[PDB]
């Protein structure tokens, strides 16, 4: 029903992510935690087809259907005010077993709305940042082999816009912003959801049992009605484990989710080290250590930077320059076909 | 473009919650659920009941007692809250709607003209310099005349305000009655349903009153509570986007003013004109346009204090 | 069931519409009027999946099942005769309450019907005269820039076929006739259809009871079946509330087709105003003040010419004059680009 | 419901596959491990269509339709704390009959995952060093036609930029290292999944009886109710075949994953022997026998070499020099077209 | 290409026709249909009965008598029938998939690269017949040399005669279950089903058997012996399409043989080489080159018995 149609929703709506913008693993832990939940209500709604009925009331043998149907809906809908078990104290709350399967739909929204906005939020000023770095790169990549074969011609420097905008980009403290505060939005909901559910696992062990009472507004009188129906809701132990296997699984994700948030350690390799090698490309070492744009602009090339055709080339160059060969870089620059 | 960061997402939001609430209604219907369920003696057989719970299902609308509260109170909303949503669903999604149908071509010809204007003065300004340094070895704004004009114009403006103004009153309907419903959805269940009408009424099998009950007034009672914390919570949203010149923030054309052929001016439309309307809109849509990011790198340049001479920069620029 | 299908056709069809042949106002009221009835016999139908039955007779106790639902049904097909109700005199219209939402159908069909006869009748026509015009208008400005260069570069008239088209159509009136029969139409049907439903909502007000009798072919002679059964039909409530929404929606919505139908008075703006600029277009107020095609053509025109590009940089010129700056029109002209 | 859903999904995402970035042993391995067990679970649920209802207790005759209804879902919902059978010891693990359909869509989501890891980690690195070989392949043979036909010419070397890019990635032992983690998970999973369908197996053969008592709450003094309800599962003979046939599968399907799992065994044929042909290309033997990138490089290359034009026509030329005619390559080498 | 005229048909009518059936075996159900139904008397309730008739429906599996038979028999299969039929279509169906993943893309590329060749064969004579007219008034050959060198490998062979066989393999193991299936289901749709398992073997009001029937024994009778006779009728076509080499009834490379350009090689394979399973592909997808037509025509205009030269009718070609 509504968790049938909330899937093909979340699912298609992830399927045109596929064909930059997101991360390995962000992507990877937003998927997990909204398709795990749709797909385990939806199951539950098929063994509400398979075999399913919420609520049963025992009725004594002198009432006939439609008085035993009464007595089960009345118990139904009472459920919302009181009732006393004959196991525990006075009351509990028992309408957590009613709105379960819902509790989770309203999870997955939430956990689903975090990356919605990073995408209403994030993707086109990155995109067009990443994609103006990488046609400046491609362009002094360019302007290096004009210099360079127009050196071998006689013996047979534009401004670093990029850089400078590297520079001043490093200052800003915007998208680091945004992107830290989705995270943690995120974090702060399944931290939420784990809660709820080891709550819920700690209460749905004891206390699926009822005694309702149906004497509310003029059988207060009546002889032939008995006092107390012993009652019994029927799909907890389906809600219990689904309840346990969601909270084991956001146990596990939730320390990806801790680690993924310190953004300057996950920079492990940098890639503007082999641009490096370019005469053209000034020596910088843009290992920023701090929390500035840079470090999620350095985070973003890592996966993109497969994208530009002169990153493959130039770093063969230094594995060739590395291999031991006395070669000319000249030579082989002359040597790499213009892109 | 057509469209705003925050109004797509209040219009959204404001008309996906009620379906999506209605539909996990009609979903818990499925799973279990009868709207009335009255309880008949024992002697009744199957249809007599059956026949009971019809007629006391369709007896709401007249009037019915209940021994608890005074002679009556209205009952039939417990019937008709799943089609007062859907009215709240059209109704929302009306003025967006027409606003498509009375907002879109306009701002979309006019956007596409001004974008083209820039990109045809940044052009020029290229040629103008260039022309300039070879030498060593003015077209007429049509776009700022056109924005002069539009900022003495008060249509645009109008009528998105009127469409966030009637958004806004049928959200505050939409709360009040949520809210009057939450009140009444506490206490009122139940019923006292009589059956003896027509020809009955001189019977003596029938009883007289039959305790019948409500049985989907939980299930409307917490939907409508959850209907009305998240109006509430999204009315401010609206009252914020209201209001039009505040949320120009950011003075896009400050970078544009950069280019020699462009004249100094602060469009900085205080009041309440086609302009400012046009500002917010150029806010959104400006990153479509090349020639900004372009200029915006310059001016940070020049900022950074090097004592590069524009034409030396603009000429390292290639034609877009 | 069928409206489910109805309700696909018709706004399917209406999103083919949203990608010129239409008004701004007239098709809000076109999309209003056709959407609303549908939605509410798909919220009836949606009713009887929650609960809903049409009928439900009260047959005494002896009856067993088999007996009591023949009863049901002889006296849900026995409404279309006759049949007495015990408040009332003889007799009264009963078998509204059955067809109600084939009513609802068919009224949304007759308001369905006439943009459905104007897409047909005025569309192409209307659609093959703006384009010509735009495209002269186009071709007009044009050549006024090309005689104010040639003017300057020297100082270093070709038949207005548009106007005299214009002119000819303001003398016909076929397309007023035929957009003004669709509005008379939409307006009669709409009409109808209020005071039926105002009659409804009249009737289904104190006569949803029934009294029913059973004893038709050979029970006559019987003893067992006792004589009247107190049938009373279920969804005489929904049906009145569905009518009375209906009825106040279309009185709200009557007066703005009332004010639609006049053609004349919602020419406010008068856009060939603006290309009396133009040196080559002869200054004609357009102010067709009668029933004239032209008319018409001035209220589609009106809401197209964003579509055009010299209205946009022409109004532009004119008020600058305004302004008060002395500047000579042919500076500014040939300081505007070719389109 | 969720299986028809889960199906439509896994085979969805499958048939976009179909249009390298995959292997011939390996794509089929993944099909079959998580389409079988979707399909006997889906042809489960037909069934439970067909005719099919999970539990059934026998209750007295004195009991009603209600009664009895209740006491079979009571005995559905207390499967999960436990009951007695009258032919064993005091209990056993009944509520995986309940569970045995969630299991096999559980095993079927973590068959999928890996693929879907590798899919989304090492996807792009691989297409573009295949691109990035094939395109300098291409052009080293197009390099070797103009140094052959220019030498002709004269009758009447650009540096090995990709074979040096080739001994870099020899030392890498990073796509490896991703590519053996996600055969070793999908290999664990199979295990598991077989000694789970085995333990079923056993445990599915003589325990879906019950006795089942209702006397919890306050019936516990009741002197109508009886004890003991002779309840007995019904869907366990069903679960049992397919839980047969699915060990079955995936015992036949492991030794396939185990061989596969050798990475440099599966480099049965030396594809580059074939390019060591062109005279501007260096005779290296790239016959890696180690656990190293170039092995997994080599067998993807294997495969997508027929997507390369150059091979074709070059093993013509070899073949041609093994008949035994004394041709000069020079000759066969101006008897190509240029590509 | 990637298939042939006679395998797609047998790999088609095998895998639709089980599935049809069954899809109608379901079908029936829905007018009418309940697989199992026993008798139980009339003092139990509803209840009671249902649970003897799902009682008798699983203890099927594990032995129930008949009282027109000796001891026990093979019930479970009448369960299983519109299952093992699903079975046996995934593995008919499995076959022509690992072709498609084995076979395809290597005869695509090598059909492509022999019929370019064979264009650019063409072309090539018309030029070098073109430039003797011209006068008055030999590139070596890859593909040829190319199919010498592929009548020497047999690996294509193998894979498609593997895959025949596991199709045929399969069918025969369909065609003796189903017939055994329909020698079974013939006497023994009865049952006497017991209901005294655990704890009321001490019981008294139950009675000792029951009487049941399963009820969809003839359908699956009928289905099973539709299915065999369509099968028994369609492998001979499968065997006879298993001889590779006698399908090549044509010899399609005898017309390209005319050209003068292409040397006479009579390629005529008598054994199992991948040769004559790409004669059979080529003799198929000859259609798509347009070298043929043309010159299959010329030989004919030869054949007429005119005595027009072939350079004259050469030169009356114009270039593809
Ligand atoms: C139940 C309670 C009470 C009642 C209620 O409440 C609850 O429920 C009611 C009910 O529920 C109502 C809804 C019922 C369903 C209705 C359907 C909807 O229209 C349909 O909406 C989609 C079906 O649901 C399809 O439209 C697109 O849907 C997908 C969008 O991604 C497809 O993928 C495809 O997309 C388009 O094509 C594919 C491209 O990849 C896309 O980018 C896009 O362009 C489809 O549209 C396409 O469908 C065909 C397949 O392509 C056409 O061929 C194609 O036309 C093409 O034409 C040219 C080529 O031939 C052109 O070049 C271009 O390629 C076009 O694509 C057409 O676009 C379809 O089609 C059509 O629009 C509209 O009636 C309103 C609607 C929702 C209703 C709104 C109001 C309600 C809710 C009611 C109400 C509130
Ligand atoms: C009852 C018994 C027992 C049970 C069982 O047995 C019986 O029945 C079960 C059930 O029945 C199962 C089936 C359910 C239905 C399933 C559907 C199937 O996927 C679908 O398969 C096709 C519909 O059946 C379509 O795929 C292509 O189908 C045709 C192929 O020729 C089209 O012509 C087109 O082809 C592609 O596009 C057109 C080009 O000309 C082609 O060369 C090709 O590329 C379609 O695919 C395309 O469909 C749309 C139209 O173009 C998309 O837009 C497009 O994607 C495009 O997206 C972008 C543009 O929008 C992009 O830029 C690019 O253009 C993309 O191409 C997509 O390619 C469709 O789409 C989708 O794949 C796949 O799940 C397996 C499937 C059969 C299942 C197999 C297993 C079962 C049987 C089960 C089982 C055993
Ligand atoms: C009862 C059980 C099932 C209940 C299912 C309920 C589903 C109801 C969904 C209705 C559509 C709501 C969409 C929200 C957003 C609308 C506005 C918008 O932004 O996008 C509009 C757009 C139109 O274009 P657009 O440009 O506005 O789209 C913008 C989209 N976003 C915001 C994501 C960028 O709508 C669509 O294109 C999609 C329409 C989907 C319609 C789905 C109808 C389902 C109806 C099912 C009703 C239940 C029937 C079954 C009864 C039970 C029987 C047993
Ligand atoms: C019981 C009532 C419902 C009965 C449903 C019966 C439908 C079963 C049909 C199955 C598919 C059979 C297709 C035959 C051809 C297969 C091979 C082929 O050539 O094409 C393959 C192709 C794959 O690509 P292809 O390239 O091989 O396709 C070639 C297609 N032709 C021959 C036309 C050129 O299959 C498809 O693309 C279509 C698959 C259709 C699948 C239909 C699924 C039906 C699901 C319902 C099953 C029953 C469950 C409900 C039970 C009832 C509950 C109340
Ligand atoms: C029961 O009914 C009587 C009248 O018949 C009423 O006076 C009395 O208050 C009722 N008893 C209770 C305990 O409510
Ligand atoms: C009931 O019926 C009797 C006669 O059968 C009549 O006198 C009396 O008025 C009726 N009761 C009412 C309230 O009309
Ligand atoms: C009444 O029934 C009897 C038989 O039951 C029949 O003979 C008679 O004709 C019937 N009355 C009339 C007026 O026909
Ligand atoms: C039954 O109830 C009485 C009190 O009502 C109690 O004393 C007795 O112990 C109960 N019997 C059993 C077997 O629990
Ligand atoms: C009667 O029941 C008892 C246990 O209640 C059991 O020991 C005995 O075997 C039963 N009698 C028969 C004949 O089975």
Same mark, same amino acid.
């Given at each position: 029903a509504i968790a049938q149609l909330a899937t093909e929703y979340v699912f298609s709506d992830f399927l045109l992510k596929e064909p930059r913008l997101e991360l390995a693993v962000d992507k990877m832990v937003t998927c997990i935690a909204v398709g795990l939940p749709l797909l385990l209500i939806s199951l539950a709604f098929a063994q509400e087809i398979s075999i399913g009925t919420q609520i049963s009331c025992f009725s004594p043998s002198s009432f006939s259907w439609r008085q035993a149907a009464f007595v089960d809906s009345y118990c139904w809908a009472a459920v919302q005010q009181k009732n006393s078990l004959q196991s525990e104290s006075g009351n509990l709350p028992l309408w957590l077993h009613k709105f379960f399967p819902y509790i989770l739909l309203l999870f997955a929204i939430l956990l689903y709305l975090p990356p919605l906005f990073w995408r209403f939020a994030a993707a086109p000023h990155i995109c067009s940042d990443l994609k103006f770095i990488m046609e400046e790169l491609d362009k002094v990549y360019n302007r290096a082999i004009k210099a360079a074969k127009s050196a071998r011609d006689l013996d047979m420097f534009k401004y670093p816009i990029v850089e400078q905008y590297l520079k001043t980009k490093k200052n800003s403290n915007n998208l680091i912003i945004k992107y830290i505060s989705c995270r943690l939005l995120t974090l702060i909901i399944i931290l939420l959801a784990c809660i709820y559910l080891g709550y819920y696992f700690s209460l749905s062990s004891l206390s699926d049992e009822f005694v309702c009472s149906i004497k509310s507004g003029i059988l207060r009188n009546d002889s032939t009605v008995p006092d107390q129906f012993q009652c019994k809701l029927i799909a907890v132990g389906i809600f219990q484990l689904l309840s346990v296997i969601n909270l084991v699984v956001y146990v596990l994700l939730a320390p990806v989710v801790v680690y993924t948030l310190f953004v300057p350690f996950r920079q492990k390799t940098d890639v503007l080290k082999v641009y490096e090698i370019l005469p053209t490309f000034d020596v910088l070492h843009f290992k920023s250590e701090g929390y500035n744009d840079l470090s999620l602009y350095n985070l973003f090339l890592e996966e993109n930077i497969?994208?530009?055709?002169?990153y493959k080339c130039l770093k063969v160059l230094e594995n060739i320059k590395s291999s $031991?060969? $006395?070669?000319d870089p000249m030579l082989l620059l002359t040597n790499l076909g213009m892109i």
């Amino acid at each position: 029903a509504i968790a049938q149609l909330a899937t093909e929703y979340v699912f298609s709506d992830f399927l045109l992510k596929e064909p930059r913008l997101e991360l390995a693993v962000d992507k990877m832990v937003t998927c997990i935690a909204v398709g795990l939940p749709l797909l385990l209500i939806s199951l539950a709604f098929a063994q509400e087809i398979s075999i399913g009925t919420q609520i049963s009331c025992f009725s004594p043998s002198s009432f006939s259907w439609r008085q035993a149907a009464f007595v089960d809906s009345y118990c139904w809908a009472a459920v919302q005010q009181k009732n006393s078990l004959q196991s525990e104290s006075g009351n509990l709350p028992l309408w957590l077993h009613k709105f379960f399967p819902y509790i989770l739909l309203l999870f997955a929204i939430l956990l689903y709305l975090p990356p919605l906005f990073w995408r209403f939020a994030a993707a086109p000023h990155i995109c067009s940042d990443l994609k103006f770095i990488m046609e400046e790169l491609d362009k002094v990549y360019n302007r290096a082999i004009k210099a360079a074969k127009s050196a071998r011609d006689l013996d047979m420097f534009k401004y670093p816009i990029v850089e400078q905008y590297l520079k001043t980009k490093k200052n800003s403290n915007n998208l680091i912003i945004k992107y830290i505060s989705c995270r943690l939005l995120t974090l702060i909901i399944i931290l939420l959801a784990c809660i709820y559910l080891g709550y819920y696992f700690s209460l749905s062990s004891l206390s699926d049992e009822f005694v309702c009472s149906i004497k509310s507004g003029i059988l207060r009188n009546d002889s032939t009605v008995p006092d107390q129906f012993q009652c019994k809701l029927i799909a907890v132990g389906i809600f219990q484990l689904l309840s346990v296997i969601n909270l084991v699984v956001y146990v596990l994700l939730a320390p990806v989710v801790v680690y993924t948030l310190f953004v300057p350690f996950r920079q492990k390799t940098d890639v503007l080290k082999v641009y490096e090698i370019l005469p053209t490309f000034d020596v910088l070492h843009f290992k920023s250590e701090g929390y500035n744009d840079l470090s999620l602009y350095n985070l973003f090339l890592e996966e993109n930077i497969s994208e530009v055709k002169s990153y493959k080339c130039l770093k063969v160059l230094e594995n060739i320059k590395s291999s $031991g060969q $006395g070669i000319d870089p000249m030579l082989l620059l002359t040597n790499l076909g213009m892109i």
